[PDB]
Amino acid sequence: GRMLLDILKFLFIYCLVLLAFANGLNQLYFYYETRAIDEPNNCKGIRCEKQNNAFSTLFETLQSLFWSVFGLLNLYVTNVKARHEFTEFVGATMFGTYNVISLVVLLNMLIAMMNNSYQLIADHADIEWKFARTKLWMSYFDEGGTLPPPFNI
Amino acid sequence: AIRKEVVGAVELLLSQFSEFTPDITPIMLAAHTNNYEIIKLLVQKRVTIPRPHQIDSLRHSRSRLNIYKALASPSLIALSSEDPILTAFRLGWELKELSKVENEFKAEYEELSQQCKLFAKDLLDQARSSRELEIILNHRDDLAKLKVAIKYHQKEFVAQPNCQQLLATLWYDGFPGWRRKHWVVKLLTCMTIGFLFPMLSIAYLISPRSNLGLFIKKPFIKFICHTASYLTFLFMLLLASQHVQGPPPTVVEWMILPWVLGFIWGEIKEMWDGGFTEYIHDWWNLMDFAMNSLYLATISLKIVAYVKYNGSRPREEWEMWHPTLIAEALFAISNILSSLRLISLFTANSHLGPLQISLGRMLLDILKFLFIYCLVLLAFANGLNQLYFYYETRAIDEPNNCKGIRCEKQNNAFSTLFETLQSLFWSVFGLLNLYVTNVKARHEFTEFVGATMFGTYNVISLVVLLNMLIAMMNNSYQLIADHADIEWKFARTKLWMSYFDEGGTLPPPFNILIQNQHYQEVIRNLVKRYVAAMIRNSKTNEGLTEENFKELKQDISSFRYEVLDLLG
Amino acid sequence: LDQARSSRELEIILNHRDDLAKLKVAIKYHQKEFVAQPNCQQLLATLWYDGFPGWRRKHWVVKLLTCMTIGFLFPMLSIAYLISPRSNLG
Amino acid sequence: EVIRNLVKRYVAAMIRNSKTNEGLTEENFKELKQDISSFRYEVLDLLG
Ligand SMILES: CCCCCCCCCCCCCCCC(=O)OC[C@H](COP(=O)(O)O)OC(=O)CCCCCCCCCCCCCCC
Ligand SMILES: CCCCCCCCCCCCCCCC(=O)OC[C@H](COP(=O)(O)O)OC(=O)CCCCCCCCCCCCCCC
Ligand SMILES: CC(C)CCC[C@@H](C)[C@H]1CC[C@H]2[C@@H]3CC=C4C[C@@H](OC(=O)CCC(=O)O)CC[C@]4(C)[C@H]3CC[C@]12C
Ligand code: NA
Ligand code: NA
């Protein structure tokens, strides 16, 4: 719980990064939206068997760059039907630098950040723990002992 | 007698195995011992010190290290110098560059440079009023002494908290107690001043000398509504992403073009100042050159695409090097570079600042590692291209007329060198597959050898080198996280002090002898109470040693033999 | 080695055969602090950069240009010392 | 001729470093205590 507040200072910067690359990839691939009828099983976007239009809208692009932190996108995502090899290559390099920044740089900087925070937290532990244990204990000293299992009414 | 700080050097100034290099004069050793009384007793004898510069080799570097070791003492800077703050600054710089020149003796010249920085910082610690502090920080040989302190990279001098209070009152002028306010009131002032950048920037164009023309002259009212304006520009870039070969510009692009011209005129306005020395050394200005250069390339390819491309062809019939597609791709990359400039706005915030500057100080330690990893990339791509270059298949032979990776069927990854480097890049993440390393010709030995080469690439790159990068950033982040909050405040005073100058208007498109007597009168008091504080700290903090035991032993022994000689 | 206050003394130390004999014995017995002592590193650096007055004083772009232009000339510097060893290029 | 000088100024530097860097201990306290005590009994034995 004392390291979560140090993660939340970092997710703002990472969300700043997602915003950046979603702005770029939406700007590059918004010309290539296809209707849902044109793909098999009448399915559009990611969460399809055929990952078809991920960088089409801004919400689907934010989603797309979210799911690529884990190994859940594919390289056939960055293609278009129109076979434009320069824009598909530039989009794949934008997706590659997102993968380097988000997965190699920022994730391991978050690891080092939580090492240095966990070393500072783990000294003041067992008096930080006992304060919360006395708050939990001292919440049950009061007169209101009626049970929330509906006996409370 | 000078080594032991005995003031029985008055007798030796009154009236073969030297344990010193014979370059040592008494004032060099007096400065090495840092005793103020002996240095005063020898400076009152009018002795000199050589200047180090030149037109068998251990005596030369040893003697130069003795000369710079004596000049870097905080008592020869406190005495015999016109102002000790500029002397500590210039000596800190000359010892830092002199440590960078000589690979040997680096850890000693860096120690002397940190001594020179710590001395000047301890001179600011002795200022006990704000008239004294304003006489210090304004002394032109504006805030001249802070510009010189940032120029010579004096990070402990600037991050000293009295200087931070003075810079904070210069920063928040027109705000009685901004830090006393609650952060919701802070957020409402940031937002409501953020919306009014045309209402605060049309004034200072029509009425500069007015009640509103003097309101954007405040630097915190520069920072807010220079950066909320940038958030409106990035809002226009978000709006821009929501067939003609070369089209006329969109209404969004017509709104965006003078923002872009305000950025380019702003950066040319910064390249007129100084030269390509401070500009090109700053990474964010290099990122401004990349961003604005891609803006010039994008707008130029819109103009080229508008010229003599009159017809309309469908999108899937265009050539690969059509300047419309290149203008859209470079526009997207410039949107990534323009939308990553908000990371530089973190130094103004007290929570995100030291984090951002710690990440920036670990990036230079990652870039030393990506060279080694790229060598590994070159090694295994050489091997896998060499093994699989016999098995190239044409794009017609696969389904959907697709070749390489970025296909549904990952077919020819180790075919060319360019695709093999791309293949070993994408396998760091879980994005290749094991069907990649096959050939159509069913050669099980070469497919097995290629899969073992791919496996050792995965062990070296993912298990060995990635976790060595993790341990590397642990050990670097522990070293960086001690000097944070003075490394952060130096960059925050550079960001603050960038908004103190004359050129106030935003890039939204609107863009288009008495002093020396008072200073010596302050410096004399600071040196006097500094030296008093340092001898006080030497009395409190010096632990006792064996020679102090020998002094008491000789006092009791000599008094013993003297009483026995009187009574005998 | 820290007590050597001249380079005649340091060259008498590091050349003492019971060439650089005492450094070969120091590397042979894995004496890593002896060799990494900075006066020894200055002597090895002057033996290393002979024919370069102040290589470390130069800027790294000039260093890169000397590394590249001396790098291209390995036939022009290796055909000499095969035909004319005792020459200005050999 | 070089080794003799290096050994001589080495040993001088090491006894110098032992004088500077050795912290005081309890037996050094007992030495001062016996010096003042023995000088005390010697003066009391001369004046008695
Ligand atoms: C603090 C905020 C964030 C800090 C910013 C981070 C600093 C930037 C880090 C480097 C920038 C990313 C490099 C570009 C990625 C790319 O090239 O993108 C790779 C692209 C993407 O694939 P394509 O072939 O489809 O384009 O591939 C190529 O263009 C061919 C060249 C491949 C060679 C790349 C070698 C670089 C590898 C470095 C990372 C290796 C991972 C480490 C494993 C241990
Ligand atoms: C500083 C620069 C870089 C430093 C160099 C790094 C040192 C080298 C590290 C070891 C070399 C790689 C080993 C070869 C990989 C390989 O065998 O490649 C594995 C190959 C590849 O699969 P194929 O069967 O398809 O060829 O598999 C086999 O040949 C069958 C044997 C499998 C048993 C392998 C057991 C070794 C596993 C070690 C890594 C485990 C990961 C750790 C997880 C916690
Ligand atoms: C949520 C994700 C999508 C990022 C949101 C993008 C922007 C809305 C955020 C990213 C970083 C934020 C910035 C982070 C830090 C600052 C400094 C901050 O100022 C302070 O913290 C105090 C200033 C002072 O007192 O000196 C107010 C604006 C600003 C630019 C913030 C403005 C809003 C920014 C640009
Ligand atoms: Na700039
Ligand atoms: Na994975």
mmCIF file of C-alpha atoms in Angstrom, chain A residues 6 8-10 12-13 16-17 19-28 30-32 50 56 58 68 70-76 78-79 81-90 92-97 99-101 103-106 108-117 119, chain B residues 234 237-243 315-321 325-326 328-333 335-336 339-343 346 350-352 355-356 358-360 362-363 366 370 400-402 405-408 410 418 422 425-426 428-432 466 469-470 473-474 477-478 481:
data_model
loop_
_atom_site.group_PDB
_atom_site.id
_atom_site.type_symbol
_atom_site.label_atom_id
_atom_site.label_comp_id
_atom_site.label_asym_id
_atom_site.label_seq_id
_atom_site.Cartn_x
_atom_site.Cartn_y
_atom_site.Cartn_z
ATOM 1 C CA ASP A 6 4.769 5.677 -5.841
ATOM 2 C CA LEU A 8 0.556 6.257 -9.232
ATOM 3 C CA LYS A 9 3.153 9.004 -9.716
ATOM 4 C CA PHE A 10 4.540 6.915 -12.595
ATOM 5 C CA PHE A 12 0.664 9.609 -15.118
ATOM 6 C CA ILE A 13 3.921 9.787 -17.095
ATOM 7 C CA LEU A 16 1.363 10.727 -21.150
ATOM 8 C CA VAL A 17 3.318 8.308 -23.349
ATOM 9 C CA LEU A 19 -1.392 9.624 -25.320
ATOM 10 C CA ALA A 20 1.567 10.541 -27.450
ATOM 11 C CA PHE A 21 1.783 7.300 -29.410
ATOM 12 C CA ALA A 22 -1.998 6.998 -29.710
ATOM 13 C CA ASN A 23 -2.054 10.504 -31.178
ATOM 14 C CA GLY A 24 0.599 9.479 -33.694
ATOM 15 C CA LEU A 25 -0.831 6.086 -34.645
ATOM 16 C CA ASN A 26 -4.414 7.378 -34.875
ATOM 17 C CA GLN A 27 -3.102 10.229 -37.020
ATOM 18 C CA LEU A 28 -1.342 7.802 -39.334
ATOM 19 C CA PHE A 30 -7.306 6.996 -39.416
ATOM 20 C CA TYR A 31 -7.518 6.895 -43.239
ATOM 21 C CA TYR A 32 -7.926 3.105 -43.229
ATOM 22 C CA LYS A 50 -8.721 -11.323 -36.802
ATOM 23 C CA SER A 56 -8.688 3.372 -36.456
ATOM 24 C CA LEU A 58 -8.595 7.093 -30.700
ATOM 25 C CA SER A 68 0.636 -4.374 -26.399
ATOM 26 C CA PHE A 70 1.410 -7.640 -22.637
ATOM 27 C CA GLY A 71 1.995 -9.992 -25.526
ATOM 28 C CA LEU A 72 -1.547 -9.653 -26.860
ATOM 29 C CA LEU A 73 -1.261 -7.683 -30.071
ATOM 30 C CA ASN A 74 0.283 -9.049 -33.241
ATOM 31 C CA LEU A 75 2.327 -7.592 -36.063
ATOM 32 C CA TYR A 76 -0.486 -8.042 -38.585
ATOM 33 C CA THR A 78 -0.103 -2.487 -38.216
ATOM 34 C CA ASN A 79 -1.012 -3.391 -41.812
ATOM 35 C CA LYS A 81 -5.577 -3.456 -46.816
ATOM 36 C CA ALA A 82 -4.268 -0.880 -49.302
ATOM 37 C CA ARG A 83 -0.657 -2.246 -49.171
ATOM 38 C CA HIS A 84 1.137 1.043 -48.420
ATOM 39 C CA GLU A 85 4.557 -0.199 -47.362
ATOM 40 C CA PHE A 86 5.981 3.164 -46.283
ATOM 41 C CA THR A 87 3.136 4.069 -43.922
ATOM 42 C CA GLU A 88 2.970 0.496 -42.624
ATOM 43 C CA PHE A 89 6.714 0.621 -42.010
ATOM 44 C CA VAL A 90 6.562 4.022 -40.281
ATOM 45 C CA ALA A 92 5.595 -0.350 -37.254
ATOM 46 C CA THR A 93 8.554 1.787 -36.190
ATOM 47 C CA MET A 94 6.231 3.934 -34.078
ATOM 48 C CA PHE A 95 4.857 0.739 -32.522
ATOM 49 C CA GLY A 96 8.416 -0.513 -32.029
ATOM 50 C CA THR A 97 9.563 2.623 -30.229
ATOM 51 C CA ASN A 99 7.485 -1.129 -27.190
ATOM 52 C CA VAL A 100 11.057 -0.048 -26.360
ATOM 53 C CA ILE A 101 9.965 2.968 -24.301
ATOM 54 C CA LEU A 103 8.528 -2.241 -21.992
ATOM 55 C CA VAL A 104 12.315 -1.907 -21.796
ATOM 56 C CA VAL A 105 12.754 1.624 -20.454
ATOM 57 C CA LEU A 106 9.730 2.572 -18.342
ATOM 58 C CA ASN A 108 12.383 -1.485 -15.628
ATOM 59 C CA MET A 109 12.606 2.088 -14.345
ATOM 60 C CA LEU A 110 9.435 1.246 -12.418
ATOM 61 C CA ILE A 111 11.243 -1.860 -11.115
ATOM 62 C CA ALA A 112 14.219 0.208 -9.913
ATOM 63 C CA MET A 113 11.775 2.776 -8.517
ATOM 64 C CA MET A 114 10.046 0.129 -6.431
ATOM 65 C CA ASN A 115 13.367 -1.298 -5.264
ATOM 66 C CA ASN A 116 14.439 2.083 -3.938
ATOM 67 C CA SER A 117 11.009 2.767 -2.476
ATOM 68 C CA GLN A 119 14.050 -0.314 0.821
ATOM 69 C CA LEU B 234 -2.078 19.212 -28.851
ATOM 70 C CA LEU B 237 -3.553 17.604 -33.099
ATOM 71 C CA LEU B 238 -6.028 15.237 -31.442
ATOM 72 C CA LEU B 239 -8.780 16.994 -33.402
ATOM 73 C CA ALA B 240 -6.792 16.657 -36.644
ATOM 74 C CA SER B 241 -7.154 12.844 -36.718
ATOM 75 C CA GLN B 242 -10.966 13.094 -36.939
ATOM 76 C CA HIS B 243 -9.362 10.542 -52.592
ATOM 77 C CA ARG B 315 -5.905 5.489 -52.076
ATOM 78 C CA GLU B 316 -4.839 1.905 -52.837
ATOM 79 C CA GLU B 317 -3.450 2.899 -56.278
ATOM 80 C CA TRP B 318 -0.843 5.387 -55.023
ATOM 81 C CA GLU B 319 2.896 4.827 -55.232
ATOM 82 C CA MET B 320 4.935 4.027 -52.131
ATOM 83 C CA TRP B 321 6.896 7.303 -52.180
ATOM 84 C CA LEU B 325 1.739 9.428 -47.512
ATOM 85 C CA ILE B 326 5.166 10.697 -46.459
ATOM 86 C CA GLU B 328 1.081 12.023 -43.189
ATOM 87 C CA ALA B 329 3.731 9.685 -41.744
ATOM 88 C CA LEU B 330 6.083 12.534 -40.798
ATOM 89 C CA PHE B 331 3.085 14.406 -39.409
ATOM 90 C CA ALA B 332 2.333 11.409 -37.177
ATOM 91 C CA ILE B 333 5.952 11.188 -35.967
ATOM 92 C CA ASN B 335 2.719 14.336 -33.269
ATOM 93 C CA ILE B 336 4.592 11.815 -31.115
ATOM 94 C CA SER B 339 3.070 15.144 -27.512
ATOM 95 C CA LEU B 340 6.143 13.893 -25.631
ATOM 96 C CA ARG B 341 7.183 17.485 -24.858
ATOM 97 C CA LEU B 342 4.786 17.428 -21.889
ATOM 98 C CA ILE B 343 7.382 15.352 -20.003
ATOM 99 C CA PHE B 346 7.247 17.830 -14.979
ATOM 100 C CA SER B 350 7.205 18.858 -6.805
ATOM 101 C CA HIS B 351 6.017 15.246 -7.175
ATOM 102 C CA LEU B 352 6.784 14.489 -10.827
ATOM 103 C CA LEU B 355 11.093 11.359 -10.779
ATOM 104 C CA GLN B 356 11.413 12.760 -14.326
ATOM 105 C CA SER B 358 15.946 10.635 -12.236
ATOM 106 C CA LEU B 359 14.589 8.878 -15.354
ATOM 107 C CA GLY B 360 16.521 11.317 -17.525
ATOM 108 C CA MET B 362 19.159 6.787 -16.084
ATOM 109 C CA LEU B 363 18.610 7.123 -19.862
ATOM 110 C CA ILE B 366 20.681 2.719 -20.784
ATOM 111 C CA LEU B 370 21.973 -0.485 -26.107
ATOM 112 C CA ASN B 400 -2.636 -12.660 -49.393
ATOM 113 C CA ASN B 401 0.535 -11.661 -51.356
ATOM 114 C CA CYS B 402 2.319 -10.862 -48.085
ATOM 115 C CA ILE B 405 6.746 -10.421 -40.661
ATOM 116 C CA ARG B 406 3.727 -8.090 -40.294
ATOM 117 C CA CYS B 407 1.755 -10.837 -42.045
ATOM 118 C CA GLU B 408 -0.812 -13.266 -40.659
ATOM 119 C CA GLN B 410 5.096 -15.056 -40.638
ATOM 120 C CA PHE B 418 16.942 -5.720 -42.830
ATOM 121 C CA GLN B 422 13.612 -6.535 -37.592
ATOM 122 C CA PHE B 425 14.016 -7.007 -32.572
ATOM 123 C CA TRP B 426 10.457 -8.295 -32.380
ATOM 124 C CA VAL B 428 12.464 -9.605 -27.408
ATOM 125 C CA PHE B 429 8.721 -9.239 -26.975
ATOM 126 C CA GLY B 430 6.533 -12.267 -27.493
ATOM 127 C CA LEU B 431 5.744 -11.407 -31.109
ATOM 128 C CA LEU B 432 7.574 -13.958 -33.206
ATOM 129 C CA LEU B 466 17.647 -7.640 -19.766
ATOM 130 C CA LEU B 469 20.012 -3.932 -17.378
ATOM 131 C CA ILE B 470 17.644 -4.249 -14.394
ATOM 132 C CA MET B 473 19.377 0.550 -13.259
ATOM 133 C CA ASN B 474 19.055 -0.476 -9.616
ATOM 134 C CA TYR B 477 19.006 4.656 -9.459
ATOM 135 C CA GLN B 478 20.449 4.331 -5.954
ATOM 136 C CA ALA B 481 18.268 9.149 -5.863
#
